[PDB]
Subunit: 269 residues, 3 copies
């Protein structure tokens, strides 16, 4: 139960709906705390195998309203980064300021053909936040990140897709069905512990200085999964001509050799 979001779980898929639509879902202190609580709920709910984030009304999110000195956007961004479930943004409308910076830590961005995007910070005399200086170059590459943040231009879904911010474009009526089809295909076919480990190694090894770091972690991951009941279930089911019902859960069966919840310290100098 939230004031700034709707939250629904159906068919193994959580939908978090940004829900201040009279304000084009403008981001507030409470949406920040609530989105952190939404991801705590999705990480803990074994019935959740994928998460869709979308906007109510016309917009996705048009921007921010008006020893934790921490940017609110960043707190959400860092929470999603250490998320254990697939996260898909279904961008239905304007995603401006923190409204676009919030999507960069999500795993897959789908956009309505109506969607608009703008890193408008420099036009307002402020700066890109939500750790977008880290995320944005790893989605669209440095040159595009610099051009969008320098001009602060509001650009089309078509530019978003050509420059690689969004995976694919959908008719307004087709967006959530598309996000759902991806979410359900993961929920149907993949073992939730394997998905959670994959998510964490891909995101975390993007900042690693050498593939040795990945080799050390992914050696321990494949050793642990190799001895798991999920691997056995995968064998049985193929032989017995049936869809696997992976039994191991993100809530209990996450391998203990690595703290999937860990993050470096927030310290000011």
């Amino acid at each position: 139960s939230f004031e700034t979001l709707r939250y629904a779980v159906a068919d193994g898929v959580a939908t978090i709906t940004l829900h201040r639509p009279d304000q084009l879902n403008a981001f507030t202190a409470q949406m920040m705390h609530e989105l952190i609580a939404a991801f705590d709920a999705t990480d803990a709910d074994d019935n959740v195998r994928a998460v869709i984030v979308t906007g109510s009304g016309r917009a996705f999110c048009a921007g921010a309203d008006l020893s934790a000195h921490r940017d609110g956007g960043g707190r959400v961004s860092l929470r999603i980064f250490r998320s254990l479930k697939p996260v898909i943004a279904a961008v239905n409308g304007a995603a401006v300021g923190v409204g676009v910076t919030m999507q960069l830590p999500m795993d897959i961005r789908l956009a309505s053909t109506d969607a608009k995007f703008g890193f408008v910070f420099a036009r307002r005399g402020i700066t890109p936040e939500a750790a977008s200086s880290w995320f944005l170059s790893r989605v669209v590459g440095i040159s595009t990140a610099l051009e969008w943040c320098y001009t602060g231009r509001v650009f089309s879904a078509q530019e978003a897709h050509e420059r690689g911010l969004v995976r694919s474009l959908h008719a307004p009526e087709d967006l959530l069905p598309a996000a759902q089809a991806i979410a359900r295909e993961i929920a149907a076919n993949a073992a939730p512990v394997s998905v959670a480990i994959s998510r964490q190694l891909i995101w975390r090894m993007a900042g690693a200085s050498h593939p040795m770091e990945a080799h050390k972690l992914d050696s321990r991951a494949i050793q642990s999964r190799g001895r798991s009941a999920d691997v056995k279930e995968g064998v049985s089911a193929f032989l017995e001509k049936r869809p696997a019902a992976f039994p191991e859960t993100v809530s209990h069966d996450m391998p203990d050799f690595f703290d999937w919840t860990s993050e470096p310290p927030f310290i000011l100098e």
Copy 2:
């Protein structure tokens, strides 16, 4: 005043013109010192809100002529990296050897349809320089970087654009107008301190191991800009139906919590 460059400031835009055209603007010791001095001038001139780099004559730059044991190309590359203004390359002609490696630290590459590019080092029995082993993978990605440096092939503007070295292609007469329209749109719409912080965080956080690093810096940046006169000017101007005249300057008003001029030590082992 320079021997190897022209330097002009009009309408908030600096144009640095590589200017040894009888030698296809071949890079020399003096062009190196002069380009460092050109960026010192652009960083210090509050009338400069964007920088265009271009070539005189037929070529952009066809290559190098013939306890600082430092590659000259790198010295320029590292100077641009810690630059505080948007830098756009307008590649008018051949950009060979250090002539292409010099553009990779710039923020946006525009090319004439006449432009040609070649990382020809290995064909001459030498090696890619100007820290291109760091920059080139972050523009075009590792596989393309390897292929261009292995073959040393001189390739077309069209390949440059398809593989992502250049943002866009222009008729020879359209190149500088296009570079100018981008430069003027930044100079017109964005607060110079916000642009300078954005530039530095995007480039610097591309080497950061985790988004926590960006969150720490961009929390301090948004706190500082939040209390700035630029933010106020942005409010006034919207209400009073007028273009903002951001008053804070890169020369004085750069926030002091981070040394924007800092770089790691050059030490030989």
Copy 3:
């Protein structure tokens, strides 16, 4: 001489052929040791100036059969990473599981129009290996890496090329000729020491936190090559209207200021 591979050297090009075709070249303990030995041979053979890896029969490689607790895939991946010669994958058929993760450390991926690819780990209750959590984001970028590993979908050559896993697509009969034309153009035109240094700096500086790291190494590399006989041979040959016959070799003439064979320690916690 190998049981799981064919190995041939012609015209300066080594071809390593994955060769358990009755098993769609499934990866085994012995293919792992043999591929390490194949790269030791290619690194030491000055007659080898480029390496092509390809599959026998219908498939490239359909997956794994069935205080070094090290993933076998990773051992190959890490060996290729510290390889000194250009490595091109010619993907002739299905490349599933470790069959696709093995290609990511190679320098250039060419695919037959018949080729298929799938990161199917999560569908089998296991996890992406061969340090693919490091390599895959640096080939196709994080969002695509996440989508392929979450769904475990087997996808077409066309998707592989559009999302940037493969450089180019070839008719089945055209694949090895294309891989050869690239290999021979390197073998013909580039100095082997320059190629080996380039390979190592591009791959290693992709994990470096700042371009200063590249500037330090590439300053020493260009100083050393500047005094080399290859550079002289390059001068003579241009004047004397003839193709250079670079005399310096990867076996003897690798500059000594950096250990090209070095890798960080494999240690379990």
